[PDB]
Nucleic acid binder design. Structure first.
Ligand SMILES: [K+]
Ligand SMILES: [K+]
Ligand SMILES: [Mg+2]
Ligand SMILES: [Mg+2]
Ligand SMILES: [Zn+2]
Ligand SMILES: [Zn+2]
Lengths: 468, 468
DNA sequence: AGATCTCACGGTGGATCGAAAA
DNA sequence: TTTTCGATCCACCGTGAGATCT
DNA sequence: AGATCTCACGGTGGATCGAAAA
DNA sequence: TTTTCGATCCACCGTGAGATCT
C-alpha cells in the first residue's frame, strides 16, 4: 500500500537514530502535508521489529545480564538470511553450511561500570562448497549479533566461566532448519582481544607433540576451537619466552642447564640483558610473574617484536631470526587473509634458519607448532585471520551500546532497560535491515614488515590503527 | 514542485532536531524508495534559513559575545509577521503598532560557565487599536527572539551596563517599514527575573511624590520603562522594609523617632522580633546590608508574605493588612492578566485599611505608589503581567541553547560556533516557521490567596511552579 | 560569591485501552 | 471476528534551576 | 588492579568547488 | 548567464580505547 516497507522504515528509524516520538512526529508532519502513503504507522514498525527477535522463550534478561540461547540466535540468523538475502529455491539438494566467527570483549563505559558482551558474526553461508551469501565487511559491526551481555567488570575468572559455558553449548547445537533446507553451523572463536588471549593462554605445557609425537598421521579434531588457540591464538607470548630462554643459555650452548656451574651465569647474563633492555625501551622483562610462571603481557611483547633488529643486537641473538619471527607473527595477527601456500614455505624457511642455526636449544612444543604445523590450520579451517572487530568498529559497537542504553531505552524498570538494549542490538545487526552509517574516511594503509606483504593478500576493507 | 516547502522542511528540521547529515540521509533514503518530490535538497533548506536572518551588517559575533542590532531584529520580526501570518492588504490606512516585551536572564550551563542573554518577544501587532496578530503563548519560548548573548558570568554591574546600553537604543529606534506599511514599536521591559529585579532596584529614594507632590494632574512619561520598574517591578522589597519600620516603632507610635529615649527600645524590640522570626522560619531579617542600605533578598521576602498570618501575629502587626498586601502583590506577580477595575478598588480598600489604622507611620513613596497609583499602570500600559518565560519555558530555552552549542554548532572556529548558536536561536523563534514540541502535561493549577482569584482573569496558558 | 540539598519534571519504548476499520 | 492505530500509562531518574547554606 | 597520559578520530554546518541543469 | 546540488574542506575537540605507570 504505502511506499516504505515496514522493514525499510525500520532501516530509516535506525540509520537516523530516531526516537519513538521523533518517528511519530516524522510521520504525522509529512501526513499533514498531504502525502499519505510515505511512512508506516509506528504500530507497523513495532510489528516489523517483532520479526527480528528470537522467540521470547530463549532470551532471558536480568537486572544485571541478558542472554540469548545461542541455538535460537543462530536459527534466527539463518532464517533472516534465507528469507530475504537470496533468490531462493536455486539450491534444493545441495548441502548447506553457515560458517560463523564469534568472541567476546569487555568495555568500560565511563553499577554499569563495564559490560562483558559475547558476540557472533556470520561470515559465510555456503552451499555444497559453493558460496551463497557472504559478509561484505566481516570486520565491521554491521552483522555483529549479540549472544549475552552483563554488567560485570571483566575479570579472568568470568572469561573462563563464559568460554566453558558457551562451548558446552556449541557442542550441543544441532543444525537449524528453514523453509525445508537444513543448515549446519561451523563456529570459530576468533573475536578475541589481546588480554583475553592472555587470560585463556592456560595451555602451559604439553607432550613432545600431540600430532608429531616426520609424519602428520595423528589427525586433527576441530570442534571447541582449543587447537587454533593453543597454536596461534595471537603465539606472541610463548615464542618470546623461548627466545628469552635461548638468550640466557647463549654463552654455554646447552638446553639441559643442570651442567657444571651454568645456572648462576645464566642468571647473571639474564640480569645484564634485562638491564640493557630496561635501558633502551624502559620495558620490563619476563623475570617474575605470580601465576602460571614467569611471563609478560602482549602489550610489551609487541614492542619486543616492533624493532626485531635492535632487540636482537642487544640480547645477543640473530637479527634475521627475530625478523622472520616478527614477520610470521605479524602475518598471523595482521587481520588480512593469509596466502597459505606462501606462508607454508616461509614457515619452513624460518624453522630451518632456526634449527640449522640453533641446535643446542631444542624446539619447545609451542615454537614447534607455530612453524611446523601452524600453517596447516589456516588452510584446514579456512579461518578469517585472527583479527576481530576493527578499532573503529569496536568503538562503534561500544558507543552504540552506550547510546541505546542512555537515549533509546525505557526507564520504566531495569529489566525493560536491558530488554531495550538487547532487542536493539539485535535489530541493528540484522542481515535483512538496510541500516546506513556516516561515510568513513580513508586511513593510511597499515604498514607491515616487507616480507609480510608477500605473505598476505591485501584486497580487503579494514582500517585499524592498533589491532585489526 | 515538491511537497514540502523549504519553509516547512525547516520546521521538520527543527522539530526533529535533525543534523545536516541526518537530514541529507533522510532525503536521500526516501529518494531511493522512488518518491522524488518529498523533501527539498539541503541547499534549499539553507536558502530558506537565509531568509530568517537579519542582514549581515547588524549581527556582530565575537569569541565571547553575539549581538544583533535591535533595530534590525525588530525590522526582521515585523517583516516575517507581515509576510506570512496575515491575509494582507486588509489594512492600508490604519495605524500599526507592534507591542513587544523584552528582558534578559543569565543561565549557568554545567570559559562557558554562564551565559547572559537578552531576549525579546513580540506580543501583539495592532492596527489602529484593533488586533491583527497575537502571540498565542506569550509565556512560552516559541517566539523568544535573541538580542544578545555573552559568555560572561552574570554580575550586578554587567546588568546595568546592559540595561543602559539597550535603553539608549530603544530610545533611538524609528518605526520599521514593510510592504508599504509603517509599523511603530512599543517595548516593555518585562522579562525580568527576581535577582535582576533586585539588582536594578536602585531607585532608593525620591521626593514626596513625583506625581502626587489629591489630583493626578502630573502626567506620565512611559518610555524607557523606569516607572513600571520603580512602581511594581516585583514592589516586593520596599513594602516589606516599610512594614518592618512599622514593626519597630510599634510600642511608641511615632514616625520621626528622634523623640525621648525611643531609638534604643526600637532596636531592642527589633532584636526580639528578629529572634522570634529566626526561631519560626530560620530566615534572616533586614538587619544589615552593605550596599544601598539595610535590605533583604526577594527569596526571603516571598516567605515573608507566604503565611501573612503568622508573621503578623509574631511581629505585632495586623493580620489582615499583611494578608491584603500579600494579596495585592501576589496578584501583581501572579503572571495572570489583571482585572484592572477590580484591582483599583482592592488597592483603595488596602490603602484605607492601612492609613485609617496606621497614621503614626506616614506612607513612604514606594507604598504610596504601589497602592494609590500602582493600579493605573496596568491599565495605561496594558502590560502583560510582570511574568516572564515560565519555569518550564526558561528551562526549555536554556536546554536548547546547550543543545545548539554542543550538537548543532560547527567546531571549525569559535566565531562560527556562536554564529551557529545565534542563527539557530533566530530560526527556532521565527514567527513563520511551524516548529513543534513534545506535548506538555497538565500541572496542578497554581493556588493563590482567595482574594487574588477575584483579582485576576484565569483564562490563559501558563504552568509555572515557582514563578510565572 | 560559591557550594550543596531538594525535588518536580522531560524523556524512554512497550503494554493496555478503546475505537475504528478489514 | 481480527488487525490497525492513536492516546495514555508505566515507573524510574538524570538533570537543572531554586533554595538553603557557609 | 586501578589510575592517568596520549592521541588519532567521529562529528559539526557553512564555504568553496565543480558539474549540471534552467 | 544564474540557480541547483552533491562531494569535499574547514579546524577544532570531546571522547574513548591503548599505553605507560604505580
Ligand atoms: K525544573
Ligand atoms: K579511538
Ligand atoms: Mg578487550
Ligand atoms: Mg535569572
Ligand atoms: Zn607437531
Ligand atoms: Zn503619588
Amino acid at each position: 500500500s504505502t511506499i516504505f516497507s515496514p522493514e525499510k522504515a525500520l532501516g530509516l528509524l535506525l540509520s537516523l537514530k530516531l526516537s519513538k516520538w521523533q518517528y511519530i512526529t516524522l510521520r504525522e508532519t509529512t501526513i499533514r502535508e498531504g502525502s499519505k502513503e510515505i511512512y508506516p504507522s509506528y504500530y507497523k514498525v513495532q510489528k516489523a521489529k517483532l520479526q527480528c527477535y528470537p522467540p521470547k522463550a530463549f532470551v532471558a534478561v536480568t537486572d544485571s545480564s541478558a542472554k540469548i540461547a545461542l541455538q535460537a540466535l543462530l536459527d534466527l540468523t539463518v532464517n533472516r538470511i534465507f528469507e530475504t538475502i537470496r533468490s531462493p529455491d536455486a539450491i534444493q539438494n545441495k548441502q548447506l553450511i553457515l560458517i560463523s566467527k564469534w568472541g567476546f570483549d569487555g568495555a568500560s563505559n565511563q553499577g554499569d561500570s563495564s559490560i562483558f558482551m559475547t558476540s557472533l558474526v556470520p561470515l559465510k553461508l555456503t552451499a555444497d562448497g559453493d558460496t551463497v551469501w557472504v559478509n561484505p565487511k566481516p570486520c565491521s559491526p554491521m552483522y555483529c549479533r549479540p549472544v549475552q551481555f552483563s554488567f560485570v567488570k571483566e575479570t579472568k575468572d568470568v572469561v573462563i566461566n563464559e568460554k566453558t559455558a558457551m562451548d558446552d553449548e556449541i557442542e550441543a547445537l544441532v543444525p537449524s532448519k528453514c523453509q525445508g533446507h537444513e543448515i549446519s553451523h561451523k563456529l570459530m572463536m576468533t573475536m578475541i582481544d589481546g588480554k583475553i588471549c592472555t587470560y585463556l593462554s592456560e595451555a602451559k605445557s604439553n607432550a613432545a607433540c600431540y600430532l608429531c609425537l616426520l609424519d602428520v598421521i595423528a589427525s586433527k579434531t576441530i570442534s571447541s576451537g582449543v587447537y587454533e588457540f593453543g597454536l596461534s591464538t595471537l603465539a606472541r607470548i610463548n615464542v618470546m619466552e623461548c627466545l628469552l630462554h635461548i638468550a640466557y643459555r647463549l654463552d654455554f650452548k646447552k638446553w639441559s642447564a643442570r651442567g657444571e656451574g651454568h645456572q648462576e651465569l645464566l642468571h647473571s647474563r639474564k640480569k645484564l640483558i634485562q638491564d640493557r633492555f630496561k635501558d633502551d625501551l624502559n620495558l620490563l622483562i619476563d623475570i617474575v610473574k605470580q601465576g602460571s610462571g614467569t611471563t609478560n603481557d602482549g602489550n610489551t611483547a609487541r614492542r619486543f617484536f616492533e624493532f626485531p633488529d635492535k632487540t636482537a643486537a642487544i640480547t645477543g641473538l640473530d637479527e634475521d631470526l627475530i625478523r622472520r619471527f616478527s614477520v610470521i607473527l605479524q602475518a598471523i595477527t595482521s587481520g588480512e587473509i593469509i596466502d597459505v601456500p606462501k606462508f607454508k614455505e616461509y614457515a619452513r624457511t624460518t624453522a630451518e634458519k632456526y634449527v640449522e642455526l640453533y641446535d643446542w636449544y631444542y624446539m619447545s612444543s609451542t615454537v614447534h607448532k607455530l612453524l611446523i604445523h601452524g600453517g596447516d590450520i589456516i588452510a584446514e579451517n579456512a579461518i578469517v585471520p585472527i583479527g576481530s572487530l576493527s578499532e573503529e568498529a569496536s568503538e562503534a559497537r561500544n558507543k552504540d551500546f552506550r547510546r541505546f542504553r542512555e537515549h533509546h531505552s525505557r526507564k520504566k524498570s531495569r529489566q525493560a532497560s536491558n530488554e531495550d538494549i538487547l532487542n536493539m542490538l539485535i535489530i541493528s545487526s540484522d542481515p535483512l535491515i538496510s541500516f546506513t552509517r556516516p561515510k568513513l574516511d580513508a586511513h593510511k594503509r597499515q604498514t607491515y614488515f616487507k616480507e609480510t606483504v608477500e605473505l598476505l593478500q591485501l584486497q580487503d576493507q579494514e582500517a585499524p590503527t592498533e589491532f585489526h
